[PDB]
Design a protein around this ligand. Structure first.
Ligand SMILES: [Mg+2]
Ligand SMILES: [Mg+2]
Ligand SMILES: [Mg+2]
Ligand SMILES: [Mg+2]
Ligand SMILES: [Mg+2]
Lengths: 370, 370, 370, 370, 370
């Protein structure tokens, strides 16, 4: 059920990691591969500790091995974008999130941060804030959810949501380790809780301003993957890992601007929702790496989910595409929540689509070029 | 016999937890679900360490997932009530016990603290003190008591009560960890001992004044559940886990007021016992989440238990519904013990019933409204 | 799958190693055996900590037991050459790399450092720099790659290159321990990454000047072997451990001189490549302990490999024998990479061949004597 | 999951059973113990093979060991009632079903055949026929249904009813062996099928005339118990072995007389149903060894069950207390089915109650004495 | 990997089944459930051995448990259609294939034999013959192909087609037992062979005239399911059990009439192929229980498969929709092969579609009514 490498003696590794480092510094480069969902990592040595991301040098990798290029010139380039403290090796080591460029210096197909940053720069004065709730499921190496009976199912749902106990919460050690690691690294993690389906968990990232939302979410995903690798289990972001009566995984997003946060911002909130109501198909396309095929299995209308083909909104409505918190309605200001995005969505795409539809008043089936 | 998540490497978790936290603080919210017996937990990040429970903000959760609401408006609200140090994450993190309210700000069905607080406030000048002895049994994940032979039984009772040795005490590590964690968290734990049935233990909480007794007992139960989850076993509060000659689990309660603690308080103790003798059915109803069905399996009159259908009292009588300690009788003052409450009772209900019957002189089959 | 000695309790060993050492110092002597691939080690006690390699004494060993001599006089002598901090015993203990000599003080057959040092001394003023990328595969004690299914294969290649996750990276603990140990010991390790074939990794050593490259690479190999022994697995440098579609292991080498590193050094780089193009067979002979038989299984022309029988070169060409980085071509200066050397090559031989062909303008089928 | 004795080598047992017997004959006496649910067996040697049940001698046993007597005179007596061929030892050995009498020759409290025989004799000229469908569940020695995931559940119901395949039918070998053994012994077994709940099966007995129905059903139950003992599993007749959404077990009974079977017997069927409609509580009391408490867990009104508190009848109605098959309604003659009896019912009690209510026109809350 | 019930002792079952039966006879009724893919079975006792299928009585079952009806009248009826010898219980026991009818005697939705029989009767004078090659895969109870490495893959395809040896053929015991059982029962089995993908096999049925083809194929499928259940494995007819480079499963069908079999029948074969070329979508719809979705995963145009979207035909072409054997072309008479049908097809649907298109000259998107 667990990987072979997880059965090695970890005391030896701790003893080795207790050695003083010296004066060299390790930096780990992270980037998104050609599938648009996976991550790749790489390590290099630095003479001294960098103080800002601008001080890190550029690097490169073979694109033909990551399904990002082919032919005689498959080399690609990594440009640092964000820097965080390394929780697996501690200070002064660093984690670096990088953008991918082709040999001719054009952004790669899956490099969606390049356009998102430019779009965000156009509405900086409005100070858009974001918050996302990432749900995921822990799986064993055999493809079965962690802690489930062999070739079987646990009891019916109901006792696992926010549950406590050896028979209600599965793999809380991973959750605690991930929370502490994210706090140490500097990620803006807001909370966690156990979900309805056993072995399914959730963590919230935010509030984040502008482009930092995607950086924080991607770094959190990478940290979760590394922690699960340490424990020997697999973390999956599939929107519907188990068919049937079991719950799916979503990536609900909170959105607000300076106008909405101010008293009587409910008018702007309703204006934004009205604008969003006319681009349901476009947003559904932008909320899935596969263009919407994956989210179809999740958004069926059953359980507390909204149908994929229909748009709806309301106040304190958990079955609607867009939900307005009751507190926001009472205090006529705040934010609104979008419940459509899938668990394996790309935050850059979601934020860019929201900004384009709500603030830039874009219309049609394609994005503007500016 | 043990949960799958208990077989993960705990050294890795310790290494992760050794990381310095920084400046953010974690707070865990705890509340009672719709069954009136289980507990639910949730974590969020705070900007700075709170100094008093009044500084914590409110929160909310989906009531339809905890069998506490249904329909279009299932949102519920959590209001902090008590704060304790977190023993699983250490300082400056906190544990928070919260009350549950409906979307219209009315207390939920299982929110019994709301009325208990007012009832206690009505008689604050008398300074009522409480003390409860919680008994529980450790179980494996297969439903069999921890340490018992597979599909079998241990030797007859007699050597296990307060026993020491590998063949007499089962799971003392859980007991020691729970004791130390409760002491660290600030819970008013008074002692522990092994019980007659193997794998059955007990801990005493008190003396506590007024409403604090329920808070302390609930927090102790939550800590026990978390510790057992860490070790991979299950702690059950069922009054009669194993049918037959094996002992049940009770929640004996001690009660006294300022008058009873002074000289010649035995007169007031006897008056209170006489008052209690006329509301046996009411108290039996109030001493069980199921209205008394569960306690029927325990209170059969055999062993050192009193019959459910008959009320009795005496001095140094272990088979009576109410017992007066011999020392109290000799010194004409002190307290008296109620042996009726079941292991899975709700402390708020028990304390409220005792206060209503003994101090407010209430009568009838229903509580007063005031 | 793991060695028996790896199942011993390592906590006991750590407890023993925690004892204070005192005033004596341990020194470990390392030398290359008669096969030209393996390493041998030996420990002795010293009165005080040596400050430089010149202070260490000479030693000896029985050559008949290492396939390095035979007959009546099989004794051999060890002469210290380089000193490093000991990462397995920490300071003040040391690691010592030694040369092997016969009973008559003539260098042994596998002692290639003797000639390499003189050759490097002949061209010291030009300041040649080197950099090598060592690839290796982790194997179980049963001869199967670590983490692979029993008598089976993992999924097709593509997700493992620079992968993260319990199902994409095998044995990262060994890699982390080796990296930290190399950093502590003073080896000039530059980076690491996961390779295309699962359970295959690599690390980069450099830049190193002159003879130090071989010392650093050999010490890194020894440290890797010791770490893998601690974890209970085997590290193999075979160029083609698994036949079929799975990738082989190489030892790509970077080379540059003072002239090449200055402005318009591309001219000298091209001249060196032109010189190299005429000694393909000689270099292939010098790049393999077996004379080229082992490298035949790797250099087949398929995948990202060049054919053994044909020489080629180009800019940003990963299928050529010699590759010129695109950045170097753009900035008309830098270094060039040789992709022919096998994983189990001897760094001294490779560096000596490169120096002889490029700087000394040697020709013919045999090396010059001077 | 299986018995320890089931792990003994069975080839040895077969070799021993291959020995020729000789002249002596083995007879196994079977009787119902004091719980009214279990069976007890006992073997003795006979000089020659008996041809009729009248040739067998009487026997006795200690009643204090079977909860059927106590005190100074606890000896009970066995009187043979029916004889069958022995399928476990083959011819000429026999199985004998016996009645239990007290030391003073009065029938035992659990001996219901004594009165049932007289009641049947009173109405012999009407030729009442009976048929019963016995449902049961196969369980492991650990208390979990055979073949279910450990501490878990299989998939939802729907594919297991009359299913075929390794993932749809559990323990078919027991069913096949029991069928063949019943056919060999002479029991009037009519068919079998897999039931809705996995590991749940069913077999039909009949048509049987008068008192032979109970004898045949009891012998079939004993044979099933012996076969399951041979295989190492447990057969349980509990009406609701698994709480929740899983189906219970019933003992539906068929009934008809000579008048009903003739042309236009539907009139008599309707008269009998009308009579039965006024003794629902009496029949519920008679259909359960515990007086109706066990059947309460099954007859909840959900699934294909009727409510215990209400009586209903109809044609081709599977949710009613009494069902008239559609073919019977079309042809105006045949039988009707009673779906109330529990799986662990006593056939003698059921048949006696049906005869008393339908043919003898008895009324009131107690049986007549005659 | 294998079922729990497969671990029960089988010598006990053989001993029980060695008992002489007697006069009564067992008959097993078989029918197709509401999914159109699965089978259900049921056993009853008969007084004497039936000689022809006309002597067997009708039966019934609850349709609400097989997804074939719902509501107040869910009772269905079984009408015997074909009879075979029982290989699991031997003579004189029988297997009975039955048709399903609703409570009003209308055929069920999945009862396709009713219309197929009439269609065959309309063209009886032309003597159509059929033959099918059923492919299947053996799976363990964990969902992985039988004999494959745990969480892994075997070597690449190429040595498994018609292979012999412990490392090339998996589960040949099931194949041998199924062959012998089919021969005993009277099924017209023509041969078997191991397929390209390891653990994949195939058997051929035919030549069969008219309606008997479907009966024979269904009985063979049932026998295979029972044998696999005996061995504890699962046989799956999924057209693409393993995604990727592994071969799918098909049900290639042969077809010919009296005119085609005569001299110069190639003209009629070509006419039939020309007719078939214009109803590709109709036949694709008729060749899959799901209307063509399952076959989409198989007919991708790669390997020895044709594209689902295109129709093609040729002589000795394995990549075409229709193949004319080279021997048939040389001899100018014989048959042609249709390679489109899926492995989980319904033979009645396939044969009916072929007859309607080729002999009745039907056109359009719907079948005629006659
Ligand atoms: Mg959530
Ligand atoms: Mg006690
Ligand atoms: Mg490489
Ligand atoms: Mg039934
Ligand atoms: Mg084939």
């Amino acid at each position: 059920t667990t990987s072979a490498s997880s059965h090695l003696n970890k005391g030896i590794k701790q003893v080795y990691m207790s050695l003083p480092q010296g004066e060299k510094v390790q930096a780990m480069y992270i980037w998104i591969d050609g599938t648009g969902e996976g991550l790749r990592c790489k390590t290099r040595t630095l003479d001294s500790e960098p103080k800002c991301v601008e001080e890190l040098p550029e690097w490169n990798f073979d694109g033909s091995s990551t399904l990002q290029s082919e032919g005689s010139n498959s080399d690609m380039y990594l440009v640092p974008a964000a820097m965080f403290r390394d929780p697996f090796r501690k200070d002064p080591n660093k984690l670096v999130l990088c953008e991918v460029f082709k040999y001719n210096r054009r952004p790669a197909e899956t490099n969606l941060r390049h356009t998102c940053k430019r779009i965000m720069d156009m509405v900086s004065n409005q100070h858009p804030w974001f918050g996302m709730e990432q749900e995921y499921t822990l799986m064993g190496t055999d493809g079965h959810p962690f802690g489930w009976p062999s070739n079987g199912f646990p009891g019916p749902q109901g006792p696992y949501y926010c549950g406590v106990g050896a028979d209600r919460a599965y793999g809380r050690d991973i959750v605690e380790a991930h929370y502490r690691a994210c706090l140490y690294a500097g990620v803006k993690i807001a909370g966690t809780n156990a979900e309805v389906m056993p072995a399914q968990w959730e963590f919230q990232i935010g509030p984040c301003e502008g482009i930092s939302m995607g950086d924080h979410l991607w770094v959190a995903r990478f940290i979760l993957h590394r922690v699960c690798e340490d424990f020997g289990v697999i973390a999956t972001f599939d929107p519907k890992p188990i068919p049937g009566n079991w719950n799916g995984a979503g990536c609900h997003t909170n959105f607000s601007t300076k106008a909405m946060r101010e008293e009587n911002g409910l008018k702007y909130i309703e204006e934004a929702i009205e604008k969003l109501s006319k681009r349901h198909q476009y947003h559904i396309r932008a909320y899935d790496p596969k263009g919407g095929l994956d989210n179809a299995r999740r958004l069926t209308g059953f359980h507390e989910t909204s149908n994929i083909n229909d748009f709806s909104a309301g106040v304190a409505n958990r079955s609607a595409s867009i939900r307005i918190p009751r507190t926001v309605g009472q205090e006529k200001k705040g934010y609104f929540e979008d419940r459509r995005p899938s668990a394996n969505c790309d935050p850059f795409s979601v934020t860019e689509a929201l900004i384009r539809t709500c603030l830039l008043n874009e219309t049609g089936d394609e994005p503007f070029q500016y």
